[PDB]
Design a protein around this nucleic acid. Structure first.
Ligand SMILES: CSCC[C@H](NC=O)C(=O)O
Ligand SMILES: [K+]
Ligand SMILES: [K+]
Ligand SMILES: [Mg+2]
Ligand SMILES: [Mg+2]
Ligand SMILES: [Mg+2]
Ligand SMILES: [Mg+2]
Ligand SMILES: [Mg+2]
Ligand SMILES: [Mg+2]
Ligand SMILES: [Mg+2]
Ligand SMILES: [Mg+2]
Ligand SMILES: [Mg+2]
Ligand SMILES: [Mg+2]
Ligand SMILES: [Mg+2]
Ligand SMILES: [Mg+2]
Ligand SMILES: [Mg+2]
Ligand SMILES: [Mg+2]
Ligand SMILES: [Mg+2]
Ligand SMILES: [Mg+2]
Ligand SMILES: [Mg+2]
Ligand SMILES: [Mg+2]
Ligand SMILES: [Mg+2]
Ligand SMILES: [Mg+2]
Ligand SMILES: [Mg+2]
Ligand SMILES: [Mg+2]
Ligand SMILES: [Mg+2]
Ligand SMILES: [Mg+2]
Ligand SMILES: [Mg+2]
Ligand SMILES: [Mg+2]
Ligand SMILES: [Mg+2]
Ligand SMILES: [Mg+2]
Ligand SMILES: [Mg+2]
Ligand SMILES: [Mg+2]
Ligand SMILES: [Mg+2]
Ligand SMILES: [Mg+2]
Ligand SMILES: [Mg+2]
Ligand SMILES: [Mg+2]
Ligand SMILES: [Mg+2]
Ligand SMILES: [Mg+2]
Ligand SMILES: [Mg+2]
Ligand SMILES: [Mg+2]
Ligand SMILES: [Mg+2]
Ligand SMILES: [Mg+2]
Ligand SMILES: [Mg+2]
Ligand SMILES: [Mg+2]
Ligand SMILES: [Mg+2]
Ligand SMILES: [Mg+2]
Ligand SMILES: [Mg+2]
Ligand SMILES: [Mg+2]
Ligand SMILES: [Mg+2]
Ligand SMILES: [Mg+2]
Ligand SMILES: [Mg+2]
Ligand SMILES: [Mg+2]
Ligand SMILES: [Mg+2]
Ligand SMILES: [Mg+2]
Ligand SMILES: [Mg+2]
Ligand SMILES: [Mg+2]
Ligand SMILES: [Mg+2]
Ligand SMILES: [Mg+2]
Ligand SMILES: [Mg+2]
Ligand SMILES: [Mg+2]
Ligand SMILES: [Mg+2]
Ligand SMILES: [Mg+2]
Ligand SMILES: [Mg+2]
Ligand SMILES: [Mg+2]
Ligand SMILES: [Mg+2]
Ligand SMILES: [Mg+2]
Ligand SMILES: [Mg+2]
Ligand SMILES: [Mg+2]
Ligand SMILES: [Mg+2]
Ligand SMILES: [Mg+2]
Ligand SMILES: [Mg+2]
Ligand SMILES: [Mg+2]
Ligand SMILES: [Mg+2]
Ligand SMILES: [Mg+2]
Ligand SMILES: [Mg+2]
Ligand SMILES: [Mg+2]
Ligand SMILES: [Mg+2]
Ligand SMILES: [Mg+2]
Ligand SMILES: [Mg+2]
Ligand SMILES: [Mg+2]
Ligand SMILES: [Mg+2]
Ligand SMILES: [Mg+2]
Ligand SMILES: [Mg+2]
Ligand SMILES: [Mg+2]
Ligand SMILES: [Mg+2]
Ligand SMILES: [Mg+2]
Ligand SMILES: [Mg+2]
Ligand SMILES: [Mg+2]
Ligand SMILES: [Mg+2]
Ligand SMILES: [Mg+2]
Ligand SMILES: [Mg+2]
Ligand SMILES: [Mg+2]
Ligand SMILES: [Mg+2]
Ligand SMILES: [Mg+2]
Ligand SMILES: [Mg+2]
Ligand SMILES: [Mg+2]
Ligand SMILES: [Mg+2]
Ligand SMILES: [Mg+2]
Ligand SMILES: [Mg+2]
Ligand SMILES: [Mg+2]
Ligand SMILES: [Mg+2]
Ligand SMILES: [Mg+2]
Ligand SMILES: [Mg+2]
Ligand SMILES: [Mg+2]
Ligand SMILES: [Mg+2]
Ligand SMILES: [Mg+2]
Ligand SMILES: [Mg+2]
Ligand SMILES: [Mg+2]
Ligand SMILES: [Mg+2]
Ligand SMILES: [Mg+2]
Ligand SMILES: [Mg+2]
Ligand SMILES: [Mg+2]
Ligand SMILES: [Mg+2]
Ligand SMILES: [Mg+2]
Ligand SMILES: [Mg+2]
Ligand SMILES: [Mg+2]
Ligand SMILES: [Mg+2]
Ligand SMILES: [Mg+2]
Ligand SMILES: [Mg+2]
Ligand SMILES: [Mg+2]
Ligand SMILES: [Mg+2]
Ligand SMILES: [Mg+2]
Ligand SMILES: [Mg+2]
Ligand SMILES: [Mg+2]
Ligand SMILES: [Mg+2]
Ligand SMILES: [Mg+2]
Ligand SMILES: [Mg+2]
Ligand SMILES: [Mg+2]
Ligand SMILES: [Mg+2]
Ligand SMILES: [Mg+2]
Ligand SMILES: [Mg+2]
Ligand SMILES: [Mg+2]
Ligand SMILES: [Mg+2]
Ligand SMILES: [Mg+2]
Ligand SMILES: [Mg+2]
Lengths: 122, 119, 55, 208, 114
RNA sequence: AGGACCGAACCGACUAAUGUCGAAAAAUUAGCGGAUGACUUGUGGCUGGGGGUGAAAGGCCAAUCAAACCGGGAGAUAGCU
RNA sequence: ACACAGGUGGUCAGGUAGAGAAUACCAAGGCGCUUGAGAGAACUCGGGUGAAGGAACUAGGCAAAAUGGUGCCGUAACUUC
RNA sequence: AAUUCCUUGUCGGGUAAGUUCCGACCUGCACGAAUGGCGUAAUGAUGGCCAGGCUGUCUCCACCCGAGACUCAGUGAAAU
RNA sequence: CGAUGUCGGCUCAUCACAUCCUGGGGCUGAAGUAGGUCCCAAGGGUAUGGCUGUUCGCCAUUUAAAGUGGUACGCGAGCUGGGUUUAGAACGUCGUGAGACAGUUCGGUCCCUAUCUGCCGUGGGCGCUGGAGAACUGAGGGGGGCUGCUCCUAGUACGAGAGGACCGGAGUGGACGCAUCACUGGUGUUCGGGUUGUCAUGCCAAUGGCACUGCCCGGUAGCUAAAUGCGGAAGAGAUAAGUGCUGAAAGCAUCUAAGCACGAAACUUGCCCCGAGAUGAGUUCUCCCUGACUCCUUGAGAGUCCUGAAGGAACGUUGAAGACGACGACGUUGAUAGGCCGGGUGUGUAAGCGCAGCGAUGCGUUGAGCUAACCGGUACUAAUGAACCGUGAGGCUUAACCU
């Protein structure tokens, strides 16, 4: 259940280590994002060499949440770390060529099929 | 709002509430009859009747439970010896409630509570 | 907080109409002793439903 | 038309493919038609029905007679349903739950669970005032209730504190899962008003 | 009541293996990818069990690639194919939510062998 | 050794809430500062009203202070209500 | 002004834990605070716990939460050393 | 600038965004040398700002435990 | 002026239309996409942040949109007190000085238990014309009315290309609302366990008290949101702007003067709730009551005895009902509460005894013991025979027809 000011570990290998959520897109007065929703990200801590330098506003997709995701069978998947993959604002599609950690089924929706191919599990 | 919710509070904090019943059990088991307020007496059924049923199976652990509750060897001695065998055929309803007017000093509905025997 | 100007005898009457407490009008009669008492309460001597259950 | 039925809690149905759907269990015993109100006598066409059972002593002569006119057992409570012009029913006729075997979506109507005297925060979803930051004796209070000397009054239908629940409400277009004939059940999806044991006027969904 | 208990006790499968908490358990799960019907596996420690008949469930924790993944299965769902127990651990609590904080060496648990 | 350090008694009174016809004409609860010194406290003295005293605020001088209180001039005076 | 949650100097100093006249639980001894009895709505007051987030609150992190002991390793700028 | 009006001066730093803050510039309406000027370690229930940690402060309120509120009996005010 | 508390924020709103979005239209320098302006339209909806006391503004990022106003520049007997206006202090400037300055700076008590109106709830009284119990009808009143993105038609019309639809159909989101606890969680001082200090039960063991529930770990029922369902409608009637069709006065022409047809989230219904005190007190159904007598201002007169039904109240046991009333269930011809019994759940292998080990401790009987609000049975306890209220065919004037 990610929202404004929430800090996320980054799943991809783009360059960012910690990224702060600044806004949840897709509808006015929208409180939270989860599962595989789009958020607006600012980068608060980067690695030295990376593709994306510090203090750069860009979009991202949530991949894991501590509160977790429900499936049709009344069954939940909780993680131990809120996390996201970075994206290229108007272009979309991820920056990082490799993705760390698992991702949900409910992320599978055409535009993120690149993430699931590169991701290791689920 | 207390839907399905059991247990009278009696304008007392838990630790106190739990003690006064522990006293009133010891009061009731020894004398075999009490006057108290009608609510207090109604809630006193849920403490005393278990101790009477626990006293049917005369074992050690049951003595140690009947002593964990109550907290008196005398009362434990009046249980098990008398009230264990005296309430055997009777399967429940060991105590009886009888309303006895109003407590003069504060108009509180009084009630006799006593064990079903008196003989 | 505070009244603008005082109420009357009438209003004060109107309000008190409901304060009139009801009587019992429902006295029992104990089967054996024939003494009067509140329903489901014991008698002052010491009876309830024709059986002595008090010292 | 519609059937009266007692609510018997909620469970769920695991559909063979995977999905677990939450269902309310409504026991719907044979609704016996007592009185057929007609345009000739009353000025509107309708039927009066009943279900369950009372004791032959708790029921009052006024109603014990009322049933004896029809020639049925004294069911607990009485309800009334409107006919749909072309329909026509007879007195002393049982209505089983097999009416809903055809239809898919239904309206359930029952009395909600009483919350008693609820505040504005609970009843009307008023926002609670600042829990600290100087605040004095006004966290969950409603704040202002009007303007000033212009209206000089509080307008009607103001959202204030008072009674919440214990009022009749309809939940609309719930999907029926199963319609059991043997034990007289009806398994509607989702949650319906009133606690276990409360009565429910179930009827076919109006919004077709 | 009888009316619910008739409907619940019907749907419950009559072939569940009796597992305790702190047991390492591989749970085979059905997944659908349009027309396909795949069996996933999901090995992990059973952190907690919840018994309510048809509504029963259990939480399994795994520490897969990267971070921890706590998954909650509805025991009597058709999606859970089989619950194969591996090691059964001697813990003396019902819920093992203290395994959220511990990782690696602290997270490992004694075996029963009873 | 120290107008040293932390910290009870004791002395103070920074924040907050409570109370605001109060439990109380300045307090309570939770924290807060000093705590061998320019410390604090008991007892008894001295300083008196244009006077005292004041690490100075016009602070304090008996719940009263940019001039106390009680009595007297005195029924001050009031183009005002 | 009251049988008023406030003010009032000196003396005596038990036990177990503790650095201690802190604190906890007890002794000797003394009290249960002079309206009670019910119910267990909003709301107020003093508290407890809280998913996911973690100052986005607000004039301001006010208030809460947090840190907290003892022994040892280690401890930067700057410095009147 | 505890001094700056014009003003949120301009440039830089910090922030996704900074009328506050830190550094610099001089155009000092109206600093300035014992009514002291500029530095300054240590000290502050001191003023401003930022970063960790921690949190019901907040998103967004939920439940719970006590004291009142509510009913019964006794006593019984007040401002107006 | 014998006091009408002045900015801003919070909470709570409400109205206007000079409309920001959504809706309907004309003209376009309208090919389509998107616009531009004007007309009709007030049903609903209408940011979160950074800076500053701010209103405003600027900036960042969203949105379908981030409307303009009124309401004592709405709302301090609803909250705040950052700002402005008390007393302290300082800077700059002005003044010989006391002091002064919409100049700046640091600090600075926000009182009130609601009589009346109003409002949200909730009863009692009488009425509704013989009394009682039900179930309706519906005058009237209230709630609700937001909307994105994604496909299909279709890469079709349009367009040299780039780009790219109208009109209809489907799915899935946000915000808001209603319900609910099966799921996911929270809570759970009334259940189980671990544990620190210390007292107590003679002591060991085992328990209990107290330390915020001493600290913690799980947690049943309930309540509940972050959890899961459902909702806004489609449809008709009458319309606005607008569009028209026949058609004179005006041998033509014109949407109109007669006549006739379309035409919007507005209006009236449809959906939901309250609702016959709707005194205009409506209806249908059922139930209950059919005895004498003097007195006489012979009056819808008043009493005397005889009769008191339907029903109701009270009292009790009580409830997923509830501040109190009220509302529902039950009162022995009885499952209303408590108990008990059997589960279920929860916690996690009790106590004692035996063996292992020097001891802490371990192991076996043992998934044991203990289990609140849960489910199903069982009259063991408590719901009393009666007394209380409530009566004895129901006025008159007209009218339609059986003796
Ligand atoms: C002590 S100065 C008071 C100033 C005044 N305040 C309220 O009225 C103005 O007007
Ligand atoms: K004179
Ligand atoms: K044992
Ligand atoms: Mg109960
Ligand atoms: Mg009391
Ligand atoms: Mg205690
Ligand atoms: Mg036993
Ligand atoms: Mg047993
Ligand atoms: Mg015990
Ligand atoms: Mg007046
Ligand atoms: Mg008067
Ligand atoms: Mg009057
Ligand atoms: Mg209720
Ligand atoms: Mg708020
Ligand atoms: Mg204050
Ligand atoms: Mg407060
Ligand atoms: Mg208040
Ligand atoms: Mg107030
Ligand atoms: Mg010192
Ligand atoms: Mg300290
Ligand atoms: Mg002082
Ligand atoms: Mg008060
Ligand atoms: Mg302390
Ligand atoms: Mg101190
Ligand atoms: Mg200190
Ligand atoms: Mg110091
Ligand atoms: Mg002296
Ligand atoms: Mg002298
Ligand atoms: Mg001095
Ligand atoms: Mg001065
Ligand atoms: Mg003064
Ligand atoms: Mg003078
Ligand atoms: Mg003077
Ligand atoms: Mg004079
Ligand atoms: Mg003069
Ligand atoms: Mg006293
Ligand atoms: Mg006192
Ligand atoms: Mg001792
Ligand atoms: Mg001591
Ligand atoms: Mg002490
Ligand atoms: Mg002793
Ligand atoms: Mg002694
Ligand atoms: Mg003693
Ligand atoms: Mg004494
Ligand atoms: Mg004394
Ligand atoms: Mg007292
Ligand atoms: Mg309470
Ligand atoms: Mg509270
Ligand atoms: Mg806390
Ligand atoms: Mg805790
Ligand atoms: Mg917490
Ligand atoms: Mg939290
Ligand atoms: Mg927890
Ligand atoms: Mg947490
Ligand atoms: Mg802020
Ligand atoms: Mg804000
Ligand atoms: Mg300050
Ligand atoms: Mg603080
Ligand atoms: Mg808190
Ligand atoms: Mg905490
Ligand atoms: Mg604290
Ligand atoms: Mg704590
Ligand atoms: Mg050591
Ligand atoms: Mg930056
Ligand atoms: Mg700048
Ligand atoms: Mg500067
Ligand atoms: Mg400079
Ligand atoms: Mg130059
Ligand atoms: Mg100069
Ligand atoms: Mg100077
Ligand atoms: Mg200077
Ligand atoms: Mg000089
Ligand atoms: Mg000088
Ligand atoms: Mg000089
Ligand atoms: Mg200087
Ligand atoms: Mg200097
Ligand atoms: Mg200096
Ligand atoms: Mg310095
Ligand atoms: Mg310096
Ligand atoms: Mg200081
Ligand atoms: Mg400031
Ligand atoms: Mg900041
Ligand atoms: Mg911080
Ligand atoms: Mg009273
Ligand atoms: Mg008086
Ligand atoms: Mg006046
Ligand atoms: Mg204002
Ligand atoms: Mg208009
Ligand atoms: Mg409409
Ligand atoms: Mg803004
Ligand atoms: Mg005003
Ligand atoms: Mg104006
Ligand atoms: Mg104003
Ligand atoms: Mg105001
Ligand atoms: Mg006002
Ligand atoms: Mg101020
Ligand atoms: Mg302040
Ligand atoms: Mg201030
Ligand atoms: Mg100021
Ligand atoms: Mg201050
Ligand atoms: Mg106030
Ligand atoms: Mg309407
Ligand atoms: Mg729409
Ligand atoms: Mg739980
Ligand atoms: Mg707990
Ligand atoms: Mg316990
Ligand atoms: Mg117990
Ligand atoms: Mg343990
Ligand atoms: Mg001892
Ligand atoms: Mg001893
Ligand atoms: Mg020992
Ligand atoms: Mg003790
Ligand atoms: Mg104590
Ligand atoms: Mg204590
Ligand atoms: Mg404490
Ligand atoms: Mg205590
Ligand atoms: Mg605490
Ligand atoms: Mg605790
Ligand atoms: Mg306990
Ligand atoms: Mg304990
Ligand atoms: Mg601690
Ligand atoms: Mg603690
Ligand atoms: Mg013509
Ligand atoms: Mg619409
Ligand atoms: Mg029972
Ligand atoms: Mg069995
Ligand atoms: Mg069993
Ligand atoms: Mg179990
Ligand atoms: Mg064992
Ligand atoms: Mg134990
Ligand atoms: Mg043993
Ligand atoms: Mg053992
Ligand atoms: Mg039990
Ligand atoms: Mg118990
Ligand atoms: Mg039970
Ligand atoms: Mg039962």
């Amino acid at each position: 259940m990610i929202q404004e000011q929430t800090m996320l570990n980054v799943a991809d290998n783009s360059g960012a280590r910690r990224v702060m959520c600044i806004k949840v897109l897709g509808g006015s007065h929208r409180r939270y994002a989860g599962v595989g929703d789009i958020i607006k990200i600012t980068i608060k801590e980067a690695i030295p060499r990376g593709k994306v330098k510090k203090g750069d506003v860009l979009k991202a997709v949530v991949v894991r949440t501590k509160k977790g995701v429900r499936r049709p069978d009344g069954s939940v998947i909780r993680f131990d770390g809120n996390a996201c993959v970075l994206l290229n604002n108007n272009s979309e599609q991820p920056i990082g060529t490799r993705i760390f950690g698992p991702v949900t089924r409910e992320l599978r929706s055409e535009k993120f099929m690149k993430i699931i191919s590169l991701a290791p599990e689920v | 709002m207390r839907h399905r919710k059991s247990g009278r509070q009696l304008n007392r904090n838990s630790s106190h509430r739990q003690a006064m019943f522990r006293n009133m059990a010891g009061s009731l088991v020894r004398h075999e009859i009490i006057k108290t307020t009608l609510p207090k007496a109604k809630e006193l059924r849920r403490v005393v009747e278990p101790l009477i049923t626990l006293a049917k199976t005369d074992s050690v652990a049951n003595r140690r439970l009947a002593f964990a509750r109550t907290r008196d060897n005398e009362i434990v001695a009046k249980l098990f010896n008398e009230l264990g065998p005296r309430f055997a055929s009777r399967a429940g309803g060991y105590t009886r409630i009888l309303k006895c007017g109003f407590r003069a000093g504060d108009n509180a509905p009084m009630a006799y509570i006593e064990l079903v025997d008196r003989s | 907080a505070v009244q603008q100007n005082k109420p009357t005898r009438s209003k004060r009457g109107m309000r008190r109409s409901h304060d009139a407490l009801t009587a019992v009008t429902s006295l029992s009669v104990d089967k054996t002793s024939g003494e009067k008492h509140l329903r489901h309460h014991i008698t002052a001597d010491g009876y309830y439903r024709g059986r002595k259950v008090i010292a | 038309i519609g059937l009266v039925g007692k609510k018997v809690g909620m469970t769920r149905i695991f559909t063979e493919d995977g999905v677990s759907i939450p269902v309310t269990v409504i026991e719907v015993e044979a609704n016996r038609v007592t009185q057929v109100k007609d345009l000739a006598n009353d000025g509107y066409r309708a039927i009066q029905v009943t279900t369950g059972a009372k004791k032959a002593n708790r029921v009052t002569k006024p109603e014990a007679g009322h049933f004896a006119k029809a020639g049925v057992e004294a069911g607990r409570g009485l309800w009334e349903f409107r006919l749909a012009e072309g329909e026509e029913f007879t007195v002393g006729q049982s209505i089983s739950v097999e009416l809903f075997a055809d239809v898919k979506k239904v309206d359930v109507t029952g009395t909600s669970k009483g919350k008693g005297f609820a505040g504005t925060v609970k009843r009307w979803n008023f926002r609670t005032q600042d829990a600290t930051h100087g605040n004095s004796l006004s966290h969950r209070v409603p704040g202002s209730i009007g303007q000033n000397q212009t209206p000089g009054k509080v307008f009607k239908g103001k959202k204030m504190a008072g009674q919440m629940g214990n009022e009749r409400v309809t939940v609309q277009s719930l999907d029926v899962v199963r319609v059991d004939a043997e034990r007289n059940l009806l398994l509607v999806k989702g949650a319906v008003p009133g606690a276990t044991g409360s009565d429910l006027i179930v009827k076919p969904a109006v919004k077709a | 009541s009888n009316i619910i208990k008739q409907l619940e006790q019907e749907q419950m499968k009559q072939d569940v293996p009796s597992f305790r908490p702190g047991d390492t358990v591989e749970v085979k799960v059905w997944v659908v990818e349009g027309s396909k019907k795949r069996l996933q596996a999901f090995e992990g420690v059973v952190i907690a069990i919840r018994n309510r008949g048809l509504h029963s469930a259990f939480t399994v924790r795994k520490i897969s690639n990267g971070e921890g993944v706590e998954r909650v299965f509805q025991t009597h769902s058709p999606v859970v194919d089989s619950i194969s127990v591996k090691r059964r651990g001697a813990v003396r609590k019902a819920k093992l939510y203290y395994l959220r904080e511990r990782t690696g060496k602290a997270a490992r648990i004694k075996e029963r062998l009873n």
